[PDB]
C-alpha cells in the first residue's frame, strides 16, 4: 500500500552554445500527472492526469515559476560544468535531476532522495539520511562544498520530509479512484515452433498497474532460468504496462512448463500453461 | 516541485 512521488528533470545543451532543451515530468507512483517542455508553446506546467486538473490557477503559476527556475538553474550548470571538465562549446551535454519521497502503507514518510547527473554519470546525490552528500568526482566535491555552505541539504530535507509527503497525500486523496488502484495482469501464452526439435513458449502479462511484476518459468514445477529471455516492462499507452517472458523448450515437452506471475494486484499468484 | 534547495553546481 506504499506510494511515491517523483520529479524528473532533463536539460540538454545544443552545439555551439546552443540553449538547452528542458523537459520536466512529475510522477505519482507509475502515473504521470504534470509536464513541462521548453519546446511547447504554452511555456507552462501542463496537466497529464485528470485529478490534477482540479487545482487552481495559482497552483499552475507557482509550479510554472518553480520549474522555470529549475531550467534556468540547469542552464547555468551546463556552462559551469563545461569549465569544470574543460570541455568545448562544440558538443552537446546533458544535466539530469531527480528527487522525490516514498511513503509507506500508512502514508507516513519512508525515505527521500535527490540525485544529480552530468552526461549520464552520477554527479552529486543526497544520502539517505538527508543530511550528507555523496560526490562522485572532484567537480562534484567543489559543488558539495558550495552546497554544504549554502545549507542545501536542510532545505531539501524540509521539502522531502514535508512538502513532498504532504502533497503526495493530497494527490492520493483527490485521485484515489485511479491512484489507489491495482490492475491485475491479464495473461495468456503463445507458442512458436523454432526447429524440428524445439519450440518457444512466450508468457504474456498485459494491462497491469503498477509496473512492478515478476515472471518466472518453471519446468516440472521448478524455477528455470536457462534458455529464457526476459523483456523490459513496457507501457501500453493507456496507463497500464506490459511484459513477457520466453523459454525455448524441447519439441513435444511444452506441457511440462508453467509460467509463474507475481503482481500486487492479483488476489493470488497466477500460474499459466500452454493450452 | 521543490521551491528550495535547488542551487547551481
Amino acid at each position, epitope marked *: 500500500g506504499s506510494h511515491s512521488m517523483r520529479y524528473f528533470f532533463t536539460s540538454v545543451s545544443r552545439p555551439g552554445r546552443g540553449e538547452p532543451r528542458f523537459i520536466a515530468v512529475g510522477y505519482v507512483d507509475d502515473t504521470q500527472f504534470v509536464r513541462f517542455d521548453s519546446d511547447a508553446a504554452s511555456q507552462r506546467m501542463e496537466p497529464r492526469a485528470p485529478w490534477i486538473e482540479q487545482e487552481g490557477p495559482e497552483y499552475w503559476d507557482g509550479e*510554472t*515559476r518553480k520549474v522555470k527556475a529549475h531550467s*534556468q*538553474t540547469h542552464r547555468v550548470d551546463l556552462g559551469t560544468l563545461r569549465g569544470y571538465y574543460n570541455q568545448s562549446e562544440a558538443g552537446s551535454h546533458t544535466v539530469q535531476r531527480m528527487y522525490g519521497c516514498d511513503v509507506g502503507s500508512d502514508w507516513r514518510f519512508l525515505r527521500g532522495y535527490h540525485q544529480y547527473a552530468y552526461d549520464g554519470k552520477d554527479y552529486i546525490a543526497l544520502k539517505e539520511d538527508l543530511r550528507s552528500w555523496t560526490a562522485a568526482d572532484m567537480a562534484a566535491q567543489t559543488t558539495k562544498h558550495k552546497w554544504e555552505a549554502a545549507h542545501v541539504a536542510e*532545505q531539501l530535507r524540509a521539502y522531502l*520530509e514535508g512538502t513532498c509527503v504532504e502533497w503526495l497525500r493530497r494527490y492520493l486523496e483527490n485521485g484515489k479512484e485511479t491512484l489507489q488502484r491495482t490492475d491485475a495482469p491479464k495473461t495468456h501464452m503463445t507458442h512458436h515452433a523454432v526447429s524440428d526439435h524445439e519450440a518457444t513458449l512466450r508468457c504474456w502479462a498485459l494491462s497491469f498497474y503498477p509496473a512492478e511484476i515478476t515472471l518466472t518459468w518453471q519446468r516440472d514445477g521448478e524455477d528455470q532460468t536457462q534458455d529464457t529471455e526476459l523483456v523490459e516492462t513496457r507501457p501500453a499507452g493507456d496507463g497500464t504496462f506490459q511484459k513477457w517472458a520466453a523459454v525455448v523448450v524441447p519439441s513435444g515437452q511444452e506441457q511440462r512448463y508453467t509460467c509463474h506471475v507475481q503482481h500486487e494486484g492479483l488476489p493470488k499468484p497466477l500460474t499459466l500453461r500452454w493450452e | 516541485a521543490a*521551491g528550495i*534547495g535547488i*542551487l547551481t553546481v
Partner: T-cell receptor
Amino acid sequence: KEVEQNSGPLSVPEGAIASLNCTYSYRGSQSFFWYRQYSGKSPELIMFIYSNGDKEDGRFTAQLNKASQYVSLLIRDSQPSDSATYLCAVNFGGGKLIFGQG
Amino acid sequence: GITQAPTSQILAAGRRMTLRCTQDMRHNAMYWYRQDLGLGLRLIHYSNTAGTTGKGEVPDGYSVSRANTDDFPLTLASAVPSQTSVYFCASSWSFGTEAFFGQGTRLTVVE
C-alpha cells in the same frame, strides 16, 4: 496584498511577551521569513522556517501551519532593541518573494 | 556583501534614472522592492539566475537587466510622482532562500 500581518502598531513593556502573526494566499508556499527593520534602515532577518511546527532560537519562537496558511513569531522577554517594524516574507514559487504590510 | 547606489535621489517627472545594485556573494537570485507606508515591501522585479528576469507585484514603470551574476540594476523609464518611495535591493543564494538586503534608496519624484 497576498501576504497580510496583524495590523499595528503594537505596544508591549520590557520583559513581556510579544506575538505577531502572518497569513498568505498561496497554499503551495515552501519558505517563510521573519524580518526586522529599524527606522530608516534595511530589513534584517530574524528567523526562517520551512516545515510545520515550532522553531525556537533563543527568545524567539516561530510557528508555521501550512494547512491554515499561517505564520507567527513569538518574542519572549521583549528588549528595547526589539522595537522595530516586523516584516513577514513568503515565497510564492521561484523568485516571487512576497512581503506583508509590516 | 550587497551594495546599493545611490542611497538618495530627487528626480524631476519624466526623467530616466537607474539605481545600481551589486552583489559578490555568488548569489543567484536578486530582487528589487519598494517600501510604502501601510503596504510594507512590494516586489518590483526579480531574477532567479544570471541572464533571466521576472515580473513582481509592481512591474509597471520599472525595468531590470541581469547580464551577469553580480549586477542587477533597476531603471525608472519615465519618472512618475507615484514612484516616490524607498527602494531596496536584495539577493539570495537561490530562489526560495533568505534574502539579504542592501542599504536602500530614498527616491522622490516631483512635478
